[PDB]
Amino acid sequence: RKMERAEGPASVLAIGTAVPPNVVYQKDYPDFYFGVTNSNHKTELKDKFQRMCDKSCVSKRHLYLTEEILKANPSLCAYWEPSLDLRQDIVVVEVPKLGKQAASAAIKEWGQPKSKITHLIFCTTSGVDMPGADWALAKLLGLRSSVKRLVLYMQGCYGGGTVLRIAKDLAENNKGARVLVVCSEITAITFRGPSDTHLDSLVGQALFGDGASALIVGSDPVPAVERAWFELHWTGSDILPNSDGAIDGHLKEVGLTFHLMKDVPAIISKNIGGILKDALAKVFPAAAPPPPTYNDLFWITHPGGPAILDQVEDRLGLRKDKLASTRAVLDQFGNMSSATVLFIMDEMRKRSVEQQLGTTGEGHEWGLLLGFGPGLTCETVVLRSVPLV
Amino acid sequence: RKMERAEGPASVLAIGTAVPPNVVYQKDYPDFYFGVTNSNHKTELKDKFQRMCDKSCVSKRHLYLTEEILKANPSLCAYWEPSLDLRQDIVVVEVPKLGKQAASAAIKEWGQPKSKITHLIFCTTSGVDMPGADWALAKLLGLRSSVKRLVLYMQGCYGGGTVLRIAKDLAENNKGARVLVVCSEITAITFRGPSDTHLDSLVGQALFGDGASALIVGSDPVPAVERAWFELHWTGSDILPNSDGAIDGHLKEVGLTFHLMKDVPAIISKNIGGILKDALAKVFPAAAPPPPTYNDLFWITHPGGPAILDQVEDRLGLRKDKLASTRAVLDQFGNMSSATVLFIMDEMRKRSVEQQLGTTGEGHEWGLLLGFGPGLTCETVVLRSVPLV
Ligand SMILES: CC(C)(COP(=O)(O)OP(=O)(O)OC[C@H]1O[C@@H](n2cnc3c(N)ncnc32)[C@H](O)[C@@H]1OP(=O)(O)O)[C@@H](O)C(=O)NCCC(=O)NCCS
Ligand SMILES: CC(C)(COP(=O)(O)OP(=O)(O)OC[C@H]1O[C@@H](n2cnc3c(N)ncnc32)[C@H](O)[C@@H]1OP(=O)(O)O)[C@@H](O)C(=O)NCCC(=O)NCCS
Ligand SMILES: O=C1C[C@@H](c2ccc(O)c(O)c2)Oc2cc(O)cc(O)c21
Ligand SMILES: O=C1C[C@@H](c2ccc(O)c(O)c2)Oc2cc(O)cc(O)c21
Helix, strand or coil: CCCCCCCCCCEEEEEEEECCCCEEEHHHHHHHHHHHCCCCCCHHHHHHHHHHHHHCCCCEEECCCCHHHHHHCHHHHCCCCCCHHHHHHHHHHHHHHHHHHHHHHHHHHHCCCHHHCCEEEEEECCCCCECCHHHHHHHHHCCCCCCEEEEEECCCCCHHHHHHHHHHHHHHCCCCCEEEEEEEECHHHCCCCCCCCCHHHHHHHHHECCEEEEEEEECCCCCCCCCCCEEEEEEEEEECCCCCCCEEEEEECCEEEEEECCCHHHHHHHHHHHHHHHHHHHHCCCCCCCCCCHHHCEEEECCCCHHHHHHHHHHHCCCCCCCHHHHHHHHHHCECHHHHHHHHHHHHHHHHHHCCCCECCCCCCEEEEEEEECCCEEEEEEEEECECC | CCCCCCCCCCEEEEEEEECCCCEEEHHHHHHHHHHHCCCCCCHHHHHHHHHHHHHCCCCEEECCCCHHHHHHCHHHHCCCCCCHHHHHHHHHHHHHHHHHHHHHHHHHHHCCCHHHCCEEEEEECCCCCECCHHHHHHHHHCCCCCCEEEEEECCCCCHHHHHHHHHHHHHHCCCCCEEEEEEEECHHHCCCCCCCCCHHHHHHHHHECCEEEEEEEECCCCCCCCCCCEEEEEEEEEECCCCCCCEEEEEECCEEEEEECCCHHHHHHHHHHHHHHHHHHHHCCCCCCCCCCHHHCEEEECCCCHHHHHHHHHHHCCCCCCCHHHHHHHHHHCECHHHHHHHHHHHHHHHHHHCCCCECCCCCCEEEEEEEECCCEEEEEEEEECECC
16 A cells, blocks of 8 residues: 655666767867858957867867758758757757667666666756657667656756756655666757857857766665665755846747856855755764865766856865866866766766775765756755775 | 655645636637637638537636737737747746746645745646746745755646656655645647647647646644645556557647647557556555455546546446546646646545545545556556545
8 A cells, every 4th residue: 555665875876978979179169160150250259269168178078969960950050040940859869869878878787677777867958848858768778668757858957966866765765666867968959159149158159068877776775786886865955045047048949048147156156165064064963973074075066167166166175186076077078967967976986996996986985966057056965975895 | 964754655735726817618719719810711620629629528718818918929829830939938937927826825725834845846838948937936935945846847748647756755755845746737838720730739729728736745744733635655657558659749939739649548548447457456465455446446537638538437437426526627627737637636625525525535545646648658646535524
């Protein structure tokens, strides 16, 4: 008359990632972007975009859109031309497909048959449809027809925190539940030509890349059969003060548009300390061990842009190595919206194993995953690593 | 280092509903719809639409769109004209607003200050935005800035089951959690002129109406302070066999479009028995009382259309009164997509109280809530009523 619940903390049992094969190196992107968009005559706009690329701390990105595809579809290279139907036709197909590559890698690592997946969460900011990308992914994988699905559309850059916040309750409240979590982002929904009109969209052109990540999340891993890599222990969500309209995105007839105030780094950096201090106080209450210091935590931080990272690091006084895993993903992949923190989680555990650190969190026991996006919404997850060998 | 979980079953503690004030009676709708759309010359198409309205078992609907608004915005009255940006500007505002009316009613009934709401789920098929309708509703209500939000976009007619499936885990896995659940639907996103092109969209014009419903869901109601009306005990989700493309909806430059095969009733009716029999077997396992008979359950059934209800009733052999609560909502409000089953839940408990039946479920202990939509997805929730006086 009842659904048995699980006992232990929701745990990450496997991670997979996937990116489009086409690589664009940042040194080449100003020429490329202004070339295929027919805007090289816009001489001062391009110098402005060159400075954004020079400062982006992005070396390369993987992009579904190629010069050939852009040549085939000139309404994408144009500026403010109607093109949503064209964008949707692309991403309603390619977002689940990219997600399927990451999902198959995570399942292969996990090692159990795909029919043990009981739940699915699909998160994307690229396109919407009915049935949704969750249904399409289930069809592509051949998941059981009774998988409990959830599609999280139009989330944006905090979505990596959101999927963990939901997956935690699904795994913990359902005995045996194994949650496939996929975030998949493809910039074909936003890509548009340059214009002194909208210097916000330029920022997006310098930073956003494509990618998908997949997790298996479940409570009570079977001993010597499944392997936990991180545990979810505490979650919080906050709308930061005086941030109305900081980050807005609209799905228009010209596609997805992006609006971004210059004070996003300030708003984030100046509020994040109180959020983290409160979260750590709840996880480590006095009544008892004190919370670890920031430098004794591992850090999985959504790299909205280098200015956000630099100002957060400065305001919290983080030692300069704490954001190294985060900054490596931004350098090699750019900002992949909701998927990015799961790429960072993967990079951190793999570094930790390769370098024989004592835990999956670079040697630290406790850790923080942060997502930031429209709201301005800050998603906080307190994680525990797992000891290695 | 941990979030305490709750103990008892997730319970519905209050329900509110809201509809646009403009009423259109079905007897008037063929003339009205073909009038404001400039299509009265389409003589045989209209006779076809008259027969759909005659058969709809819908007496009236509440619609945000008025003749005055349609006169002001002729691209809505047209057929296949670009109009998404216009539709979004409407529903990104009006869907949260309608939802706020229902939410305030549910909170007023519940009786606790609005700051005790810890979580929010907003479900809609009408428009998408960043930040989302969940953020807008929180702003309209003045909810705490740390409310844990979730926006479920592009769900469709199964969404009433989905929100209960998620809210169950949120309430049960978080001690003290009180989940505001809102479904809000406004047909301005789909409304378009008639055409022998697309006889699917005609079906939608005869059945779909507007409305919003709101729940407070929480585990462990405080005795003599909060009041439970229904308990969530079991949830299931199924993709019905040989239903690929049964019900599709796309968000296009002309707005939201709707595609619907004629065999939806057949697919639903011919598969539903096995789903319910399995669900009841899980809730009442042999090893022990047998499951109640269908006629001894209460029924909260999404009324996709009268043909779905009639064929489900026939195939399962339901006594003719079991779907009376469901059919009363369809008659007085039409199909309000994801909100409809919560209107039906409200109607049933209010009937039960008014008629002094022994339980909130028309006198029956156990009950079934069913949502159907794109997939073809069937959402099943097994509910327990609460005894009255
Ligand atoms: C890469 C930028 C992107 C980093 O460069 P920087 O350290 O700011 O260096 P600069 O200030 O020289 O930036 C160069 C140009 O970017 C422009 N710029 C920066 N942020 C901008 C914004 N939000 N909108 C428009 N222009 C912006 C500056 O105005 C400047 O123009 P100018 O050289 O003609 O004066 C940085 O501001 C950043 O990281 N911002 C975070 C972006 C963000 O908010 N992302 C989160 C997500 S949606
Ligand atoms: C109201 C209809 C809507 C009920 O009427 P009915 O009992 O079918 O009566 P009829 O078959 O005389 O219907 C009249 C017309 O509707 C048309 N019709 C019914 N379903 C249709 C569909 N999916 N697409 C196009 N036309 C349809 C019939 O072709 C018929 O046309 P005709 O009179 O010119 O031959 C009914 O088929 C129904 O309830 N369907 C369920 C709709 C549905 O699937 N909703 C769930 C959600 S998205
Ligand atoms: O406007 C967007 C773009 C979006 C996005 C889509 C696809 C990608 O591959 C990608 O890297 C990004 O991500 C966003 C995230 C936000 O928080 C706000 C936005 O406007 C957007
Ligand atoms: O195409 C739609 C329309 C949608 C809807 C929106 C707003 C309303 O007020 C309303 O009653 C309905 O509901 C749908 C539900 C589905 O399952 C499929 C759809 O295509 C649609």
